[PDB]
Amino acid sequence: TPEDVPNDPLPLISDFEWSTLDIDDNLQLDELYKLLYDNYVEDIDATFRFKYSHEFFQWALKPPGWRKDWHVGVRVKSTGKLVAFIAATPVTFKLNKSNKVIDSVEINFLCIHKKLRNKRLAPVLIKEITRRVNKQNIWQALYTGGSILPTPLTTCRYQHRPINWSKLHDVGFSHLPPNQTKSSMVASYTLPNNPKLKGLRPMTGKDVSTVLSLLYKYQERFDIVQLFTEEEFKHWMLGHDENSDSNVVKSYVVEDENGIITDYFSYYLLPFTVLDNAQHDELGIAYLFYYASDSFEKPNYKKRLNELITDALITSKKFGVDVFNCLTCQDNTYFLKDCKFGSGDGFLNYYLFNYRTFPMDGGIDKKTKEVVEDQTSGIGVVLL
Ligand SMILES: Cc1c(C(=O)c2nccn2C)oc2cccc(OCCCNCc3cccnc3)c12
């Protein structure tokens, strides 16, 4: 190409047709819900379902600067049924080593009907969202998932911090180690009911300006981070709006005796559903989002980094969280071990579409794929 006559054969008719979704129309947002609730991953064992919420979608999929045309779905011509979806959300990331800002997107929510796998549909979905994205002059992309596509940035591993061990054991998630005691393990995980750190309080739209700077100076230690604007950060830490508490994302700051912000952390909530259980049908879960501390240069860093995350946990209880989850990215390996974070079983792979760059650290010993204490990781961004 360019050619007089295309060399390869042309497409044959299909039973599916492209349909851009409108999460503004509650009727469609409802379909998206059903699609994900019925065919999206979960625990390998198979007994869990993400508990999406109308309030979670507005948060996750409508960051400032979002586009509808990036919400692509595939429906069946006959019945109209929505059988696939893939979304793209605007994000600005930067490499700290080579110093470069790259306005790109975050490919998320790739989903195909449980009974439509093995049709090479997945790939078709990507090249498409990409085609649309490439139309806005963006040429790179971030995504996480199966070790399918080659040349991944790095690999991180799951970590689970049991807040309500018992309930977890009921659902068959956490297993009781060789000779111990349900009653005893419950203590090994027990935590206070109040944040140890003083000057700790929820964040507000007034702390954005500040916190963003604190963050911007903390991430310097990673090879790839995210660069938010003021309207963006607010959204991602505060929710649709400040004048109305977000039930999805929780953020907190710590002030000193002078009224200055020295630390901060955030985390989001997205529970599970316990199926064939006669006790409960909802597992509270929180994912560690972004955080920061100006003590990184100080010598007490890690000591502080542990208190900080430990308070974040004590707060997770006011929301029904039964397990606190995070990966091995960022400087998490500093607080894992001592906070009683349990090593998981799942692995995540980060990808950067159309852009070569040195592989970074995932936080795990590349050989045993097991966690490695105090080891700053290249990955300093968090994707849902
Ligand atoms: C997934 C997940 C799980 C679990 O499945 C889990 N925890 C307790 C019991 N189970 C079965 O545990 C994690 C630990 C770290 C990061 C994680 O995931 C990080 C990525 C999260 N994506 C969530 C998401 C958001 C929007 C759409 N789909 C998925 C996870």
Q: What is the DSSP string of 277-330?
A: -SS-S-BEEEEEEEEEETTSSSS-HHHHHHHHHHHHHHHHGGGTEEEEEE-S-T
Cβ neighbours of 66 (radius 10 Å): 17
Same domain, yes or no: 318 and 365 = yes
Token reading at 297 = 């240069």
Point out the domain boundary residue: 119, 139, 159: 139
* Secondary structure letter of residue 124 according to DSSP: H
Residue 308: closest CA among 249, 251, 365: 251
Resolution in A for the shown PDB structure? 3.2
Query: Does 141 sit in the ligand 1 pocket, CB within 6 Å?
Result: no
| Residue bearing the CA closest to ligand 1, atom 26 | 384
Q: How far apart are CA 334 and CA 289, in angstroms?
A: 16
Task: Name residue, tokens 């409108």.
Answer: 22
Structural domains of the chain, count:
2
Same domain, yes or no: 318 and 354 = yes
Asked if 154 and 360 touch (Cβ cutoff 8 Å), the reply is yes
Same domain, yes or no: 300 and 332 = yes
Q: Which atom of ligand 1 is nearest to the CA of 323?
A: 8
**Structural domain boundaries, residue 49:** 1-139
Same domain, yes or no: 197 and 257 = yes
Q: Give the torsion sign (CA, 126, 129, 135, 141).
A: negative
Active site residue 384: yes
Task: Name residue, tokens 């080593």.
Answer: 97
Q: How far apart are CA 111 and CA 122, in angstroms?
A: 8
Give the long-range contacts of residues 275-283, CB within 8 A, separation 24 or more: 275/47, 275/48, 275/49, 276/47, 277/170, 277/171, 279/167, 279/170, 280/167, 280/170, 280/171, 282/51, 282/320, 283/48, 283/167, 283/168, 283/171, 283/173, 283/322, 283/323
Query: Which mutation among 54, 85, 158 tests ligand 1's pocket best, with the greatest number of atoms within 8 A of CB?
Result: 158
Same domain, yes or no: 126 and 173 = no
For residue 35, give the CATH number of its domain. 3.40.630.30
Query: Does 158 sit in the ligand 1 pocket, CB within 6 Å?
Result: yes
Q: How far apart are CA 380 and CA 377, in angstroms?
A: 7
Backbone angles phi, psi at 253, to 5 degrees: -130, 160
Same domain, yes or no: 59 and 186 = no
Token reading at 349 = 């792979």
Same domain, yes or no: 202 and 213 = yes
Query: Does 344 sit in the ligand 1 pocket, CB within 6 Å?
Result: yes
Same domain, yes or no: 209 and 219 = yes
Same domain, yes or no: 93 and 173 = no
Residue 53: closest CA among 320, 374, 271, 280: 271
Point out the domain boundary residue: 80, 111, 139: 139
Cβ neighbours of 370 (radius 10 Å): 11
Point out the domain boundary residue: 111, 139, 167: 139
Same domain, yes or no: 290 and 327 = yes
* For residue 2, cis peptide bond before it (omega within 30 degrees of 0): yes
Q: Residue 121 belongs to what H/E stretch?
A: helix 121-134
The whole-angstrom distance between residue 374's C-alpha and the CA centroid of its chain comes to 22
Task: Name residue, tokens 């010598």.
Answer: 299
Token reading at 98 = 């080579």
- Start-to-end Cα distance in the chain: 39
Same domain, yes or no: 194 and 47 = no
Side chain identity at 89, as an amino acid letter?
T
Same domain, yes or no: 336 and 346 = yes
